[PDB]
Amino acid sequence: MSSKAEKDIKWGIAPIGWRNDDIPSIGKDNNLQQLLSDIVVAGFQGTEVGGFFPGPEKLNYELKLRNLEIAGQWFSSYIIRDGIEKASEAFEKHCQYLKAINAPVAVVSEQTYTIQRSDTANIFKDKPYFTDKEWDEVCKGLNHYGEIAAKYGLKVAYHHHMGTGIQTKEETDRLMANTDPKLVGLLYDTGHIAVSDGDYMALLNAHIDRVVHVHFKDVRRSKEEECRAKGLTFQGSFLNGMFTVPGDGDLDFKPVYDKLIANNYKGWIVVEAEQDPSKANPLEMAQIAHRYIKQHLIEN
C-alpha cells in the first residue's frame, strides 16, 4: 500500500478512557493536561472533545504546546424530542466550537429515547425504535445539520450506537438510504456494531463510501457474553470490561484498516474505549493500542 494512502489517515485516541462524563466519578481526578501529554507519550496525533474540556482558547493553547489536534466532538441530537429548530440551534453552537478549535467532524447521534445512560435498561434488549414519522424528522434534521456544518467547513458523521434508535446495520442502512451523502456521513464504530449485530465487517462493506470518521473500539468477547447473560446496562457493561482498545480485546482491526486504505479513506481513526481508568490504566491502554496499530496494521 502507498505510504501516501497511510499518510492520509490521522490517528487519535479519545478522552473517555481517561475520564468519563456520564459517570463523573470515573477518572474524576484525571485532567486535560495528563491525557494530552499521555497521547504524545503513546504516539497519537490527537484526541476528541471530552465534556470536561475547557473553552477554545485554553484548549488550543494546551494543544499547541504538544503539537496535537482535535478530531471531533460528540453532539447529542434531540430532533425528535425538541424539534429541528431547537436542535439546529444546539448543533450550530457545537459547530462554532469545532471551528474555533480547528476540528473537522461533528459526531452526531439522535439521542431521543436512548437507554445508554439508564440505570436499569438492559442494553442488549431494551433499545428504543423510532416511528416512521420520527425517522422522517431525523433524516431531514441530519441533512440540515449537514447544511449547517458546511458553513463551518465541517462534516457530519452519524454515530450508530448501542441503545439508540439507530443501532443495527439495518437501521444504519435505512439512515444512509434516506439522507444525502453530501450532507450526512457515517461514523463507523467497530465496537458498537460488533455488540449490536455480532459482526463489524458487513456494515463497513455496505457503507465504506459514506465513512467520514472512524472509531476503533475493541471488544472483550468473554465480557460481552457475561454482560449479555446478566442483561446489564450500557454503563454496567463498560464498567464490566466489555470495551477496550485495539490490541487488548478480540477484534482484528486489520481488515477494517485495509478496507479504508483500499478505499482511499482520508480522515481520522480514533481509538475509543470507555473503561474505569483506575482498572485499565489510560496511558498503558494508549500504548497497547499504538503498538498494535504499528505492529499489526501499518505497513510503511
From Swiss-Prot:
SUPFAM superfamilies: Xylose isomerase-like (SSF51658). Signal peptide: none annotated. It comes from the Bacteria. One of its GO terms (biological process) is inositol catabolic process. GO terms for molecular function: manganese ion binding; myo-inosose-2 dehydratase activity. It holds the Pfam family AP_endonuc_2. Its cofactor is glutathione; Co(2+); Mn(2+). InterPro entries: IolE, IolE/MocC, IolE/XylAMocC-like, Xyl_isomerase-like_sf, Xyl_isomerase-like_TIM-brl. Keywords: Cobalt, Lyase, Manganese. Pathway: Polyol metabolism; myo-inositol degradation into acetyl-CoA; acetyl-CoA from myo-inositol: step 2/7. Its EC number is 4.2.1.44. Belongs to the IolE/MocC family. NCBIfam families: myo_inos_iolE (TIGR04379). This is Inosose dehydratase.
